[PDB]
Amino acid sequence: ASYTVKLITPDGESSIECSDDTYILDAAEEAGLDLPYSCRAGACSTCAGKITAGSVDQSDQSFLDDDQIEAGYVLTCVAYPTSDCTIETHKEEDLY
């Protein structure tokens, strides 16, 4: 399955295709976007984004708390799309 991922960045929106077995950060990088990351392992907030439509599988995430997850926050470095989705990027600074 190929999903359309609309990335809402501080500098503009860009829609990319992302396979069901590709992490959203990896898809973004292949498409030529420059999204933030550090550990690439689900254990920080550098790569945080926020889902505003659709769904992901981020079962390997181990930084976000349940309230953050229920608000739509996602660790892009470990999140596979499970539908077409819309994700706001560069959201680390919105976390508290």
Side-chain angles (χ1 to χ4, degrees), residues 1-16 18-69 71-96:
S2 164
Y3 298 111
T4 299
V5 182
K6 180 189 283 179
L7 295 164
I8 301 180
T9 89
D11 291 320
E13 299 181 0
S14 193
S15 296
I16 70 173
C18 185
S19 295
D20 60 81
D21 67 352
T22 296
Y23 292 136
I24 294 154
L25 175 61
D26 302 1
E29 280 169 346
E30 299 165 4
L33 297 178
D34 181 346
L35 303 186
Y37 64 88
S38 188
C39 76
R40 230 157 161 122
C44 86
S45 55
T46 298
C47 69
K50 193 183 67 160
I51 303 160
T52 59
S55 58
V56 303
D57 166 16
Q58 59 177 331
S59 55
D60 281 343
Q61 87 81 208
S62 74
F63 184 89
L64 297 168
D65 73 48
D66 291 348
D67 295 307
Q68 292 169 331
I69 294 275
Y73 292 91
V74 54
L75 300 188
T76 65
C77 72
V78 289
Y80 297 109
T82 57
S83 73
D84 297 330
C85 52
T86 301
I87 303 174
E88 295 180 349
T89 73
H90 299 76
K91 301 293 278 189
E92 178 174 41
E93 53 320 293
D94 295 333
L95 297 172
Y96 50 89

